[PDB]
Design an enzyme around this catalytic site. Structure first.
Site, mmCIF file in Angstrom:
data_model
loop_
_atom_site.group_PDB
_atom_site.id
_atom_site.type_symbol
_atom_site.label_atom_id
_atom_site.label_comp_id
_atom_site.label_asym_id
_atom_site.label_seq_id
_atom_site.Cartn_x
_atom_site.Cartn_y
_atom_site.Cartn_z
ATOM 1 N N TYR A 77 0.848 -1.183 0.000
ATOM 2 C CA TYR A 77 0.000 0.000 0.000
ATOM 3 C C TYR A 77 0.882 1.231 0.000
ATOM 4 O O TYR A 77 1.676 1.444 0.924
ATOM 5 C CB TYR A 77 -0.902 -0.002 1.231
ATOM 6 C CG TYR A 77 -1.814 -1.221 1.381
ATOM 7 C CD1 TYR A 77 -2.299 -1.920 0.269
ATOM 8 C CD2 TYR A 77 -2.233 -1.635 2.637
ATOM 9 C CE1 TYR A 77 -3.145 -3.024 0.430
ATOM 10 C CE2 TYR A 77 -3.075 -2.726 2.801
ATOM 11 C CZ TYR A 77 -3.511 -3.420 1.707
ATOM 12 O OH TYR A 77 -4.348 -4.494 1.895
ATOM 13 N N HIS A 96 -0.213 -12.037 0.621
ATOM 14 C CA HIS A 96 -1.076 -11.019 0.029
ATOM 15 C C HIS A 96 -1.458 -11.372 -1.409
ATOM 16 O O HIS A 96 -0.589 -11.445 -2.287
ATOM 17 C CB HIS A 96 -0.322 -9.695 0.010
ATOM 18 C CG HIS A 96 -1.195 -8.521 -0.215
ATOM 19 N ND1 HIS A 96 -0.747 -7.227 -0.045
ATOM 20 C CD2 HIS A 96 -2.495 -8.425 -0.580
ATOM 21 C CE1 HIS A 96 -1.719 -6.388 -0.322
ATOM 22 N NE2 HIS A 96 -2.803 -7.082 -0.638
#
Length: 315
Positions: free
Chosen positions: A58, A123
């Site tokens: 992110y 992820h």
């Protein structure tokens, strides 16, 4: 009235039913000053949110660095909040190798300014080889867990098939938690079909994207949203129905996501103090009033033609 907390699988962790998705602190959706990020995190924690999720992806590691400054600014004992991060997905691509994820936890702990995270998850594994996840990545996370740098381990991704593939192929008790997104919301409740499976396996469940990445908003989804035109059209019609009838599509969508107590938390991305108040308030009002079932029935009728439809992800 305090924000409800829910037990996460067999971990012993009790998570606020609304969780803080820290992706916006990495400037993912627009520029946010460091002062604003800190204020938002402090306000979230003051309103009872104790769970903070991030990833090296992110903001190309910026979310982790900002979140680390925010957590320090809480001035709270480490055991008063729960931190989750991820590994395997980076701004420079996917690498689920044992060497990469073992290095990644140390990089994340440096940016977060922590000695350990509570949760570490692979992820978006639909972009990897699921056999590598099973045979290489998960064993490497077990070693990280053994070192204490994370307390619990998990996997994330869009397609629900990745969870059955991986969990069918690891020993009982290997995975502690999963994070799923876009499948427990007003247009797609397929995560509920996985709950018996996750319960049988003792796996706690985190949900995210209750607004389905902007579908359940008055403004509607961003131009990049991968949903089909038919999904978008029905979600816009549901938002329009709410608007016409003086109701808030996003509040109702979050309340729907929060209603299933077998999901321990729903992550919401936040970057202003008013967003904290709105999201926590939706949860508190749900607890004391329950769902507005007349309104949810009308939304269900509008979304019926596209219910549970998704979109491609990964390889």
């Amino acid at each position: 009235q305090k924000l409800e907390r829910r037990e996460l699988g067999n971990t012993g962790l009790n998570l606020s039913c609304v969780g803080f998705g820290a992706s916006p602190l990495g400037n993912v959706f627009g520029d946010v000053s460091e002062e604003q990020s800190i204020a938002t995190v402090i306000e979230a924690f003051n309103q009872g949110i104790n769970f903070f999720d991030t990833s090296p992806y992110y903001g190309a590691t910026l979310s982790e660095k900002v979140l680390g400054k925010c957590l320090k600014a809480l001035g709270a004992s480490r055991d008063e909040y729960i931190v989750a991060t991820k590994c395997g997905r980076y701004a420079e691509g996917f690498d689920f190798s044992a060497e990469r994820v073992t290095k990644s936890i140390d990089e994340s702990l440096e940016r977060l300014q922590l000695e350990y995270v509570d949760i570490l998850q692979c992820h978006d594994i639909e972009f990897g080889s699921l056999d590598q996840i099973v045979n290489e990545t998960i064993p490497a996370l077990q070693k990280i867990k053994e070192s204490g740098k994370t307390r619990f381990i998990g996997i994330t991704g869009l397609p629900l098939e990745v969870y059955t593939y991986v969990l069918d192929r690891v020993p009982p008790g290997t995975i502690d938690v999963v994070l799923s997104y876009c499948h427990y919301c007003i247009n797609d409740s397929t995560l509920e079909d996985m709950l018996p499976y996750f319960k049988s396996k003792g796996v706690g469940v985190i949900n995210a994207s209750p607004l389905s990445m902007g579908l359940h908003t008055e403004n509607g989804p961003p131009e990049w949203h991968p949903a089909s035109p038919e999904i978008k059209a029905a979600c816009k019609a549901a938002a329009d129905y709410c608007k016409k009838n003086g109701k808030n599509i996003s509040k109702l969508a979050l309340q729907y996501s929060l209603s299933n107590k077998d999901i321990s938390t729903t992550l919401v991305g936040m970057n202003s103090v008013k967003q904290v108040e709105e999201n926590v308030g939706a949860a508190l009002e749900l607890e004391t009033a329950g769902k507005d079932e007349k309104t949810f029935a009308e939304i269900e009728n509008i979304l019926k033609p596209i219910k549970n439809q998704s979109w491609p992800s990964g390889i």
